[PDB]
Amino acid sequence: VKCQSPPSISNGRHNGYEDFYTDGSVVTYSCNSGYSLIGNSGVLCSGGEWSDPPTCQIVKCPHPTISNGYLSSGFKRSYSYNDNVDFKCKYGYKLSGSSSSTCSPGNTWKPELPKCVR
Secondary structure, eight states, rough: OOOOOOOBBBBEEESSSSSOOSSSOOOEEETTOOOEEEESOOOOOOOSOOSSEEEOOOOOOOOOSSOOOOOOOOOOOOOOSEEEBBBBBBSSSSSOSSSSEEEEEETTESSSSOOEEE
16 A cells, blocks of 8 residues: 655645655644644554644634633743643632643643632
8 A cells, every 4th residue: 555645734735755655654734824733743644544634723822811820931912832821829729620731723721721729
């Protein structure tokens, strides 16, 4: 079985390091300047069939806010895919949820923002 170069994708493209993949190979796809590449940064042609291909969407999360348990490690007026914001529970409060989230590739803060509780 063989795996020719992968076809284009969601407004994105593919450019690994060859033009005749076969099996167990991978291709780091590319997204238009502005679209985030979601997935395992590399398609996976296994058995002559490309699989688990990444996406080319816009990863612009809202804001990693929370009940006083805001973050104090890396928070910018704007973020996108990654940018893990650590949540500093305001005062001796506990963060019910996750004290460390990140601007995922779906425009959000995963895991679910934390909750500063007592």
